[PDB]
Every structure is written in C-alpha cells, then in structure tokens.
C-alpha cells in the first residue's frame, strides 16, 4: 500500500465525522452545527454544546453548516469547524496530510460552485496539500464491494435515493426525499407535547431536546410496521372480531414505556402509536393535505429506478439495481425499516427479485458515509481518485 496517511472528514447535514485513514473508527463525531454565544464566539463539539445548551443562556443560538442538499452553505463557519477539528481532535497542521472529504449525489448543477468554495477553503485558507472529494452514495457502495447499486440512504435531512451503475452515478435518477430523521424529531415532539407540558431564535432548546430525550425516544420507541399500517389495522381488527365472536389478541395494543427524565415521568405508547411516526416517511399525505403520496419513500424509490431505466434495456437496469439494493443511514436502523423499504420496493417491481445489503452493525451505518470515504483513502493507487492540487485551482482561476 501507499506511504501516506489521510485526514478523512465527512460533513453530514446533522453529524460531522473526522479521523485518520490509518484506524478503523473516527476520532470524533460532532454536530454539524454550533452555538454562537455572545464580542462573538463559536462553540463546537457534542459535550461542549450540550453543556452550553443546558446553561440556558440568552444570546446563545444554534446555527447549521449543512443545508438539506447535504451541502455546506456557511463557509466562514465551516472553516472554524475544520480548524476546531484539526486543532483539538486530530491535532495536526492541516498543511501536512492529504484530505479526503464527501459530497452528496447531485443532478450536476451545484457541483462547480461547490468545488470552488472547497478550493478556497482547502487552499486559500487552510493550506491543505491536496484533497479528494468522494461522492457519498458511491463510496458507501464501493466500501461494500459493489460497483453498481441502488443506494437508499435515510438520514436526518430525508431519504436520498441514488442509482449507481458500473461505478458511475446516474445524476438524473438521483432523488432526495424531504422526510427523515429531523422530521421524526419534530413529530415525536409535537405528539408527546401535551404529556411533557410543552404544548430559529429558540434554536438552543429545540436542539438540546433533539440531542437528548428525543434521540433516545427514537432509538427505543419507534418501529416501522412491515406493511401499510392502515391495512395492518383493518386486518388486525377483522381478525380480532373473530377471536372474540368465535368463543362467545390484537398486536397493536401492546404498550411501550419510556421514562421521561426531565419530569421523572413515564410515557406509555401503544404499539400502533409507535408505528405511526415512521409511517409518515412512507405516506406523508397523512400529516398534511399538501403532500402527495408520491413524496413518500415508496413511490420515490420507484420513480428513481424508472428514471434510471431512461439511462443513457429498462427491464435490465431495473434488474441490476434491484439485485444490489443498499440500505444505509442512521434512521435506517429503526426497527422494521429494512423490511418495509423492501416490501415497498418489491410491490412496485413484482417481476424482479430484490436482494438488499446493509451493514448490520449499529455504529457503522450511522457513520457509513465516513467509513466509505475511509476505504477510498486506503485505495492502493493515487490514480484511483481525482486529487485536486493547488494547481487545479490556479488553472481554474484563469478567465
């Protein structure tokens, strides 16, 4: 292998992952947001922010670095974050080592403008020697031994569906849902509000709650039902009637208990109410009358495959993609999720056999994007990736 050690940085819209290419896990996972506390001042890091957030001090406000595109939109802040990472976590001059960072799949447009802002940050400001940009869905797929794959990423910003054929990304078939993890935080909060008393500028408390009890609730209460929930209900009812009538147990009546710490208070949901939260990802027409069933994850996956079949047979691409389905993302770890994504895919494409792949290790999908970039950085040849040097920048600067 090569005589080098890279810094690997992944700026997700929710989490930021950083570490060196020479070890199996990242040195740090910190929030892709910061507190601006006021003479201004910028707080980064999971415990630093949760401490400051709990202080409940006026003028403290949480801002974000990554928009819903998965792309950085506040570049002055991003530099401060990178400085923070290099200074306090990796503890190395940014000038020494090659850098590997990620971008999300796009349709192609915002690409050049981004690349430029990265030149300015990597070169003008940090003095990085050289960097590679890997495309998240692509790296994750490669890290998994796959050159062609339908990559279904369910993160905080929403679902990102990306067909990848023979190492190439099909941009026009790239699809980004708007409903994911962060959406789930909103719904858990709005729904539980009356039991916990509670029912931008108030960003600090929203954030702190999202990062504390709401995060635990998601990891322990929510489940995704295997089949359209409204149907599951009608069925379970229809069956329940017969057990009852017959003599003279509906699974949705099981209760689940969550200790809510801030008030030392038990919150009990029935299994249906637990299934209900993720149902919105699949049938978002159930919150507002302003969402079409087509904004739901099932129709969306289908849409993106069909748009893959338009290249540039279809019942071949369909077959390729569907035998290499990759399910990934923090939110994809919610119990029942893989199976519903599968059921939802299988019924839009009955003629085909689906085979899906997913990291089964809890940690590794939360940071599978970073894991992907890592396996790119450990590729044995410099010729395997585009590596931008200070040169490239100079030459772009000409007219």
């Amino acid at each position: 292998t090569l005589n080098r050690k890279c810094v690997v940085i992944h700026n997700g819209s929710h989490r930021t992952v950083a570490g060196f290419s020479n070890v199996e896990l990242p040195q740090c996972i910190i929030p892709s947001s910061y507190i601006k506390r006021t003479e201004a001042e910028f707080i980064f890091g999971t415990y630093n922010m949760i401490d400051a957030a709990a202080e409940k001090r006026n003028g403290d406000e949480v801002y974000t670095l990554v928009d819903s595109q998965g792309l950085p939109y506040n570049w002055d802040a991003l530099e401060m974050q990178w400085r923070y990472l290099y200074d306090t976590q990796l503890k190395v001059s940014p000038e020494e080592l090659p850098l590997v960072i990620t971008m999300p799949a796009t349709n192609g447009k915002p690409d050049m403008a981004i690349l430029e802002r990265y030149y300015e940050l990597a070169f003008d400001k940090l003095n990085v020697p050289v960097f590679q940009i890997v495309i998240e869905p692509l790296a994750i797929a490669l890290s998994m031994g796959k050159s062609s794959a339908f990559v279904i990423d369910i993160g905080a910003s929403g679902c990102n569906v990306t067909p990848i054929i023979d190492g190439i990304v099909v941009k026009n078939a790239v699809v980004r849902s708007k409903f994911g993890g962060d959406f789930l935080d909103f719904q858990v909060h709005e729904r539980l509000a009356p039991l916990i008393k509670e029912e931008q500028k108030r960003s600090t408390d929203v954030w702190y709650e999202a990062s504390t009890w709401i995060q635990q609730f998601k990891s322990t209460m929510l489940q995704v039902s295997e089949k359209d929930l409204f149907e599951l209900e009608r069925y379970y009812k229809e069956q329940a009637d017969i057990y009852a009538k017959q003599q003279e147990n509906n699974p949705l009546v099981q209760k689940k208990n969550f200790l809510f710490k801030p008030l030392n208070k038990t919150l009990t949901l029935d299994l249906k109410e637990c299934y209900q939260f993720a149902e919105y990802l699949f049938k978002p027409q159930l919150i507002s009358d302003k969402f079409s069933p087509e904004d739901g994850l099932g129709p969306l996956m289908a849409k993106s495959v069909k748009k893959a079949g338009a290249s540039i047979s279809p019942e071949q691409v369909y077959s390729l993609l569907l035998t290499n389905v990759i399910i990934t993302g923090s939110t994809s770890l919610i119990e029942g999720m893989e199976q519903r994504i599968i059921k939802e895919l299988s019924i839009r494409f009955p003629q085909y056999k689906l085979t899906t792949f997913a990291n089964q290790v809890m940690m590794d999908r939360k940071i599978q994007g970073w894991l992907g970039a890592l396996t790119m950085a450990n590729l044995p040849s410099w010729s395997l990736g585009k590596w931008y040097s200070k040169e490239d920048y100079e030459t772009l600067k000409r007219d």
């Binding site: 080098r4 020494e96 050289v130």
Partner: protein, 54 residues
Amino acid sequence: MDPQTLITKANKKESWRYDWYQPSKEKYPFRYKTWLRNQEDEEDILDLKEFDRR
C-alpha cells in the same frame, strides 16, 4: 558510565525522518508529509532509591 555508551551497549538498523514527499505516476504536482526512510547518508543520571518508596 557515559549514558550514551550505556544505551549503545544494551539491547544487542535504519532511521526515518518526517518530511515532504512527492509521489509519482512523472511526479504528481503535490506534496505531503510522511515518514520516509533515510539513505545511507541521511547528559546525566538520576539515583533511584530517592524515588524508591519507603
């Protein structure tokens, strides 16, 4: 005895430096620090017992 010679007589051979390196395909345009192997051409003593616990 001379500390340096004590070091020399115990435990019985290359050396590395941490320096700029420029890979090739000829040479890529960029540099980066790494641990390179060098070519052919490239005080006191304290008394334990004070520090022994008693």
